Structures are given as structure tokens and as C-alpha cells.
């Protein structure tokens, strides 16, 4: 339930992302593009792993964290939005761990996500059958 020690670790992991957020915003602001916000280009450092970091990728400002801490098998998908037309500019968080709901309990605590601020994830059904 609590898991404060691991939680604070995940908190620090999130706190490590915080500085990079500015770089993400700088990218989208200066280059006017989310498309330029990839790891290893546009001033954004190349995707790498620190001692505690297991894996992380940077794609169009979106960043996936994989097997981080006890959350082995789990992948967190941080999806920043930059849509002035939708009045939205924030980071959407999602925990994808299919085999271990227990790990989700830990990640969702720090990476907590509101219904409106989570990127939708589904099994097998991602394609939208609109063209009939």
C-alpha cells in the first residue's frame, strides 16, 4: 500500500524528468515543433541510462520509461501535449504493466494520472473503425 521507500525512488525518477521537461518545452517553443523533440537532437541529450535508470526513450517529447526500479516489465508513457487550439499543454502519464498490477500501484502513485491527462491504452483495439 504505502511503499514509501520505493515511492520516493519513483518520485526522484520523476524529479529527474522535471529538468528535461524544460528542454522539451524549449524544444517545442523554439523549434515550434514536438516533432523535433527527439533524444539526441535539437539540444536534447541522447537517450541513455544513469546508474538507477533502467531504460528510457525520447520520441517527439514523449518519453517511455521501461523496467524502472522494482517496476521491471512495466513501461511508463509520458505524453506531453502542445495544442493551443485545445487549450492543452501538459504531460500525460500512463502505466503499462500487463503481468503485474502490483507494480502499477507503485508507479501510478507518483506518475498519477487523471482521466483527462492520461494517454489511452488498449489491448488489440487501438485502431478506430470509422471507415465503414
Automatic annotation (TrEMBL):
<protein>
    <submittedName>
        <fullName>Prepilin peptidase-dependent pilin</fullName>
    </submittedName>
</protein>
<feature type="disulfide bond">
    <location>
        <begin position="95"/>
        <end position="107"/>
    </location>
</feature>
<dbReference type="GO" id="GO:0043107">
    <property type="term" value="P:type IV pilus-dependent motility"/>
</dbReference>
<dbReference type="GO" id="GO:0044096">
    <property type="term" value="C:type IV pilus"/>
</dbReference>
<comment type="similarity">
    <text>Belongs to the N-Me-Phe pilin family.</text>
</comment>
<dbReference type="GO" id="GO:0016020">
    <property type="term" value="C:membrane"/>
</dbReference>
<feature type="disulfide bond">
    <location>
        <begin position="27"/>
        <end position="37"/>
    </location>
</feature>
<keyword id="KW-0488">Methylation</keyword>
Amino acid at each position: 500500500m504505502e511503499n514509501y521507500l520505493r515511492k520516493a525512488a519513483l518520485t526522484d525518477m520523476l524529479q529527474t524528468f522535471v529538468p528535461y521537461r524544460t528542454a522539451v518545452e524549449l524544444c517545442a517553443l523554439e523549434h515550434g515543433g514536438l516533432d523535433t523533440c527527439d533524444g539526441g537532437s535539437n539540444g536534447i541529450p541522447s537517450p541513455t541510462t544513469t546508474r538507477y535508470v533502467s531504460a528510457m526513450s525520447v520520441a517527439k517529447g514523449v518519453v517511455s520509461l521501461t523496467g524502472q526500479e522494482s517496476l521491471n516489465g512495466l513501461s511508463v508513457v509520458m505524453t506531453p501535449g502542445w495544442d493551443n487550439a485545445n487549450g492543452v499543454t501538459g504531460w500525460a502519464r500512463n502505466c503499462n504493466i500487463q503481468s503485474d498490477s502490483a507494480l502499477q500501484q507503485a508507479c501510478e502513485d507518483v506518475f498519477r494520472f487523471d482521466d483527462a491527462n492520461l494517454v489511452p491504452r488498449g489491448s488489440g483495439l487501438e485502431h478506430h473503425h470509422h471507415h465503414h
